[PDB]
Amino acid sequence: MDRNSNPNRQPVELNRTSLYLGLLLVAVLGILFSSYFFN
Amino acid sequence: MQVNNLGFIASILFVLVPTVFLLILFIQTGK
């Protein structure tokens, strides 16, 4: 049995604006929940 | 302050894991 190349592979993309939005989201989520993690 | 001794690892990972996910995705865009 052979290992054939799958044709369903698609590239994934994250533009720079999405990077900034996601980083700000992660940052503010950390800002929000850090006080509760430390308790 | 007698904080949760797990608060620092938790906060660090809570931010760093999605951060690296995002950075990985952004840097490989255009391949």
Binding site: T17, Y20, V28, S34 | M1
Partner: peptide, 30 residues
């Protein structure tokens, strides 16, 4: 030391703001 965590997350937020403004994807008319 929780103060270090708080300052670090706040600094990450502010630095993201700086980069998002100074180095944004330039909107172009196509």
């Amino acid at each position: 030391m929780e103060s270090v965590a708080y300052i670090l997350v706040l600094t990450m937020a502010l630095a993201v703001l700086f980069f998002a403004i100074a180095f944004r994807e330039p909107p172009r008319i196509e």
